[PDB]
């Protein structure tokens, strides 16, 4: 074991280790190839506190370490001691290593076509959400319309209740009966508006429900997506 162990990945850069360490215990580690090279430098990325910490492993003349007195020289011997000593704010040791484990044509074409539908479901999902919110805000407009025509009844009993008696005596009634026609359409008209809203209400509740289903399938694709993605690269 020397320039080629479990945790030596080298060929990878900052972004890749970043995602490999995602959500792991205080001590998960690997070593990397550093940016600027003097024929070679190395970087250890330790897990502590909920974050990725970058630590520079130095060369200089031919001995290794983290700081001024560089002792452990063989790259591996440095990790072999482990982080308690070098600063007490890093008290945990190096627990988890990382390590490694078109012929495989078939076991990826599922990632093509299950992800086909997750990029098709997120669509159905987005569209429905906007569409629901439209129906919500239309219902709002309906009640509000309903509240106007209703208030138009008030504006008619008053104004015509004190004339359903005045015209009753004026020698000439008969006008009062071509008035009721208007009330008949008014109340006939409100009923339509109430139905129009109702039909929309029992279209929303069934549009809403539909959305829950589009979500349900999505949260059940999600985890199965991550496993193929990971049966692929490794």
């Amino acid at each position: 074991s020397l320039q080629n162990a479990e945790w030596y990945w080298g060929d990878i850069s900052r972004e890749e280790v970043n995602e490999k360490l995602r959500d792991t215990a205080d001590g998960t580690f690997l070593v990397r190839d550093a940016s600027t090279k003097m024929h070679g430098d190395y970087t250890l990325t330790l897990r502590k506190g909920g974050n990725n910490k970058l630590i520079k492993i130095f060369h200089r003349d031919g001995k290794y370490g983290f700081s001024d007195p560089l002792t452990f020289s063989s790259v591996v011997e440095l990790i072999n001691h482990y982080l308690a000593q070098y600063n007490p704010k890093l008290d945990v040791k190096l627990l988890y290593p990382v390590s490694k484990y078109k012929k495989l044509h078939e076991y990826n074409t599922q990632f093509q076509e299950k992800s086909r539908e997750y990029d098709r479901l997120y669509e159905e999902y987005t569209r429905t959400s906007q569409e629901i919110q439209m129906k919500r805000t239309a219902i709002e407009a309906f009640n509000e319309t309903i509240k106007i025509f209703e208030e138009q009844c008030q504006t008619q009993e008053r104004y015509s209740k004190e004339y359903i008696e005045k015209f009753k005596r004026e020698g000439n009634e008969k006008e009062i009966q071509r008035i009721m026609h208007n009330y008949d359409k008014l109340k006939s008209r409100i009923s339509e508006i109430i139905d129009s809203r109702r039909r929309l209400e029992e279209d929303l509740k069934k549009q809403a429900a539909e959305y829950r289903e589009i979500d349900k399938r999505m949260n059940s694709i999600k985890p199965d997506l991550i496993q193929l993605r990971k049966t692929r690269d490794q």
Binding site: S13, R14, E15, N18, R22, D23, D26, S35, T36, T43, G49, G50, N51, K53, L54, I55, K56, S67, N87, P88, K89, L90, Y125, S129, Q133, M134, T137, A138, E140, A141, E144, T145, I148, F149, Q152, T155, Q156, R158, Y159, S160, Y163, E175, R178, I179, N182, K185, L186, R189, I193, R212, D215, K216, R217, N219, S220, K222, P223, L225, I226, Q227
Partner: protein, 1024 residues
């Protein structure tokens, strides 16, 4: 731009040596409608109106036809009433302006109520304009019941008063300075390669004057040193008509003096005025004229005829103008512990029980503690936990910006034998500096596409405005009393003290705390790194040590700041104190401090000052997209940065215009709809009589959105020709003629759109139906001297990515020209107005490479046509020059899709890429075609010319590389808009590769070359 980037290759001086729809459901009301009118007499008379009918005329008809019904003496004249109805924003609306057409009121169902102006505020009620502009009725705010919202609305007027005062202070000139800012570069110094277009040092500049009651033009050609204020330019024009054989010369010298300041110059053809003592060549028009082989044409014009049309005087404070017991935070003993209670529901299928738990974390961008899930224990059904969660952090050690992040989520491991849902975020602190406690119900947001990162702390802080969503009920500890963050007085004490403690040096077993430093502090080398560089534990600590030495190099601040132990109350207090009197840094460096790595009020507050002082209105106008983007990470509604932006925007209308569109374009976007809605209101309330022009641009864009909604979708998937039948008809209609004729271009408000050229506007041929519209320029000096106006209205593609790319190219170009030499890019105009709705400026006289065919050499022959003989040499100077810019830039920004119908060539010889959209990674260009045009005709690459091309590309690449940072930061600020190519720093990493960055200078130049003399090589598709 001005002249459509068309170079005149000849000027070696010597001349004399929701959704739309009008009516809910229906996209377009029928030529005629039955609109029911509800009268105050109590009777619905149903009235037949043509859709274009004005309200003045509906009223007339209603009242004429109403006296045919009962109770008609029970009337009131006619004009006493004013209609009210319900618009499809669900609100009742008084329709005070009775010019408004029936097809234009956003009615819900065709009915109008007749009432009486109770409210009697015809004036204040016409802040219905404010709602229109914002799009969202003003009073969804009036009914909010959140103290921060109501506060903001009140407190933000300070800014509006102040800004409205500044404008009128210095009566008439400052008003004009505001309405018409000087359009001016930020360095007065001319790059030497422009000097050498005026190798005399001077320029010929025609100065027209209008003489007839119906316009008559006089010239006066004039010639003057590029660097000469307009004051003086007016003089030399006086001394030219006035010159006479009776006029001596102290007779002329005096009376020039006496008339020099009674006139004003104006760019001919648009609304651009030279209102300031600036070097004549500092104005973009001028420099741009030098650049295109163009004679400046200015218009002399009396100051007093400009000042007569400037009527903004009125600003009115609106209707909404009208101590307990606390413990200082760190008195609080023992750790924070948040109680998780219960979510009400969750969208899991239940036949798949990878069960359900709440993941939580305290955060500061990246977290200040080990973060912890609660037990999985609950198997949905009634998702409940009742448990307190213990976080290892003293409550005293909570940073000011500290907040809590949570999600409901699921993962895996379960294959073999080995070991999401909805997220929400909360400010541990009030806007009033309270640390929250008690009952908290949080509606959570949906998980955004792609991001399966489990916790999403970049998503906004706030409960979900939509309460038909899973909702997580919460409990924070409650101490004897209300707990507040300590005063700034107190913190500065602690800072002082626990450094007087520091001089108890004793080597110890640690390395962070340590303070001289020898010559080997040369870690000014780290100050020079780009902001994504990554700082090692050794380095982070090195910095906190020699922090008190850092003041001597101001620009380390970003890195030092990312080295503070943000969970140490000691370290933060000490940091606070350094930030206090830190030497200020260049604006392009302060900006970084407004991204989401630097969330701390003190720090961001500092950046805002560095901006107040140093950043010029030019640079603002430029990096505006980011600044508007970056408000999204401000923790509270009322902060320093808004008070900044908003003040600027009321102070300089050219900024204002875009400040407004950039905010309006995301109003559909609920995560940010109210912060922006709120912002937008205060701005309109305070923007003067510009609101009226804005409203007209809005009016017009809606008509446009609607029209295209029928051209796709609402069937109209007919023969191309049929669709055109519809467009032509529909544009002729009088509602549309009004709506879409004579308003300011959103792409450039200095650009008046007049009447349409109906016989020039047509539907382009894309799936999405892009309307190609042409307007007349209604300027007096328009068609000669300037232009006729073409824009694309495009409704379906998300234009933000294109917007940013075009920003970045401009900047790039800007760098290469100021470094001297000189690759001309075409940052064409692009503006996103909505949910994938936008405008693109037509660059007249360009054709796709994949048009020019209908020859491998004859691209070079097409160029020798259009460009005759001698002129022809500069077309290669131009083509070669532009190809570099796009080679270099295209490579850095990583644009694939680089086929010949994406690249356009313009007649003068210019190249320019269009239709970007797709970003970094999500080789190079050089096809033979281009490689043939460079090297004027030949087939032999080892050419004299191709060699020069390499120097341009080498010199250019490295220029950008020096200016990495600006670019890393410009991209950095973007990470909070819905843009699906910029969600993580991970994403930005691409351009960190492309400019080598990690390697040396010399090394990066080698790598790029390793990229340059490569590439090499049916054409619509590709085969063998």
């Amino acid at each position: 731009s001005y002249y459509h980037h068309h170079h005149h290759h000849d000027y070696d001086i010597p001349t004399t040596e929701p959704s739309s729809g009008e009516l809910w459901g229906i996209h377009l009301m029928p030529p005629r409608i039955l609109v029911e009118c509800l009268l105050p007499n109590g009777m619905i008379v149903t009235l037949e109106c043509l859709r274009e009918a004005t309200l003045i005329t509906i009223k007339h008809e209603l009242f004429k036809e109403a006296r045919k019904y009962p109770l008609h003496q029970l009337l009131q004249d006619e004009s006493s009433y004013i209609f009210v109805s319900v618009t499809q924003e669900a609100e009742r609306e008084e329709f005070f302006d009775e010019t408004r057409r029936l097809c234009d009121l956003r009615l819900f169902q065709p009915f109008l109520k007749v009432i009486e102006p109770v409210g009697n505020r015809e004036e204040k009620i016409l802040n219905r304009e404010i709602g229109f502009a914002i799009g969202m009725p003003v009073c969804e705010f009036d009914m909010v019941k959140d103290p921060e919202v109501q506060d903001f609305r009140r407190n933000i007027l300070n800014v509006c008063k102040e800004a409205v005062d500044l404008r009128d202070l210095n009566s008439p000139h400052s008003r004009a300075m505001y309405v018409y800012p000087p359009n001016v570069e930020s360095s007065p110094e001319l790059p030497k390669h422009i000097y050498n277009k005026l190798d005399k040092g001077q320029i010929i500049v025609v100065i027209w004057v209008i003489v007839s009651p119906n316009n008559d033009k006089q010239k006066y050609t004039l010639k003057i040193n590029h660097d000469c204020v307009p004051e003086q330019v007016i003089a030399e024009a006086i001394r030219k008509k006035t010159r006479s054989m009776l006029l001596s010369s102290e007779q002329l010298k005096l009376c020039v003096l006496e008339y020099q300041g009674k006139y004003i110059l104006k760019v001919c053809g648009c609304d651009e005025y030279f209102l300031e003592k600036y070097p004549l060549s500092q104005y973009k028009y001028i420099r741009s004229c030098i650049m295109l082989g163009r004679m400046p044409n200015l218009m002399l014009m009396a100051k007093e005829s400009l000042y007569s049309q400037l009527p903004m005087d009125c600003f009115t404070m609106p209707s909404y103008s009208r101590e307990t017991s606390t413990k200082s935070l760190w008195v609080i003993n023992s750790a924070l512990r948040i109680k998780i209670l219960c979510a009400t529901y969750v969208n899991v299928n239940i036949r798949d029980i990878d069960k359900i738990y709440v993941r939580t974390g305290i955060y500061h961008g990246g977290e200040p503690l080990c973060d912890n899930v609660n037990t999985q224990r609950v198997p949905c059904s009634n998702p409940r936990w009742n448990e307190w969660l213990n976080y290892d952090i003293y409550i005293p050690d909570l940073p000011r910006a500290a907040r809590l992040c949570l999600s409901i989520c699921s993962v895996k491991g379960r294959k073999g034998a080995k070991e999401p849902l909805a997220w929400g975020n909360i400010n541990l602190f009030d806007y009033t500096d309270t640390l929250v406690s008690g009952k908290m119900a949080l509606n959570l947001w949906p998980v955004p596409h792609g991001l399966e990162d489990l916790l999403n702390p970049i998503g906004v802080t706030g409960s979900n405005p939509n309460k038909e969503t899973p909702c997580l009920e919460l409990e924070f500890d409650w101490f004897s009393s209300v707990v507040k963050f300590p005063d700034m007085s107190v913190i500065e004490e602690h800072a002082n003290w626990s450094v007087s403690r520091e001089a108890g040096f004793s080597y110890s077993h640690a390395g962070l705390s340590n303070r001289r430093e020898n010559d080997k502090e040369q870690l000014k080398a780290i100050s020079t790194r780009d902001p994504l560089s990554e700082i090692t534990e050794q380095e982070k600590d090195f910095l906190w040590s020699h922090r008190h030495y850092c003041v001597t190099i101001p620009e380390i601040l970003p890195k030092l700041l990312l080295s503070v132990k943000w969970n140490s109350r000691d370290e933060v207090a000490q940091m606070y104190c350094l930030v206090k009197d830190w030497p200020p840094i260049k604006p392009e460096q302060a900006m970084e401090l407004l991204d989401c790595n630097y969330p701390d009020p003190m720090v961001r507050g500092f950046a805002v000052r560095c901006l107040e002082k140093y950043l010029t209105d030019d640079k603002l106008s430029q990096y505006l997209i980011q600044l508007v983007q970056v408000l999204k990470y401000e923790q509270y509604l009322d902060n320093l940065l808004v008070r900044f932006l908003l003040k600027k925007a009321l102070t300089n209308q050219r900024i204002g215009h875009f400040f407004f569109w950039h905010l309006k374009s995301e109003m559909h976007n609920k995560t940010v709809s109210q912060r922006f809605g709120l912002l937008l209101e205060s701005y309109c309330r305070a923007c003067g009589m510009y609101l009226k022009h804005l409203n007209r641009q809005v009016e017009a864009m809606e008509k446009l959105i609607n029209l295209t909604d029928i051209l796709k979708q609402e069937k109209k998937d007919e023969t191309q020709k049929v669709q055109m039948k519809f467009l032509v008809e529909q544009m002729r209609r009088p509602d549309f003629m009004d709506a879409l004729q004579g308003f300011l271009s959103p792409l450039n408000p200095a650009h008046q759109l007049g009447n349409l050229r109906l016989e020039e506007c047509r539907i382009m041929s894309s799936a999405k139906r892009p309307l190609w519209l042409n307007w007349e320029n209604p300027d007096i000096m328009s068609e000669l001297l300037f232009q006729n106006n073409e824009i694309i209205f495009k409704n379906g593609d998300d234009l933000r990515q294109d917007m940013l790319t075009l920003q970045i190219i401009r900047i790039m170009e800007n760098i290469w020209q100021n470094q001297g030499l000189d690759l001309r890019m075409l940052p064409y105009g692009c503006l996103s107005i909505g949910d994938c709705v936008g405008l693109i400026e037509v660059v007249r006289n360009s054709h796709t490479i994949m048009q020019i065919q209908c020859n491998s050499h004859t691209l070079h022959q097409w160029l020798k046509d259009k460009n005759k003989g001698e002129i022809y040499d500069a077309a290669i100077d131009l083509f070669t020059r532009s190809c570099a810019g796009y080679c270099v830039a295209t490579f850095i920004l990583g644009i694939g899709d680089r086929h010949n119908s994406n690249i356009m060539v313009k007649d003068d010889g210019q190249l320019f890429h269009i239709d970007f959209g797709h970003f970094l990674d999500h080789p190079f260009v050089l096809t033979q075609d281009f490689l043939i045009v460079i090297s004027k005709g030949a087939q032999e690459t080892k050419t004299r010319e191709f060699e020069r091309f390499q120097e341009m590309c080498y010199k250019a690449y490295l220029a950008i590389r020096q200016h990495a940072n600006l670019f890393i930061n410009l991209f950095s600020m973007m990470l909070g808009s819905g843009m699906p190519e910029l969600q993580s720093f991970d994403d930005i990493a691409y351009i960190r590769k492309t400019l080598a960055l990690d390697k040396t200078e010399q090394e990066a130049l080698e790598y790029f070359m390793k990229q340059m003399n490569d590439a090499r090589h049916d054409w619509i598709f590709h085969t063998i």
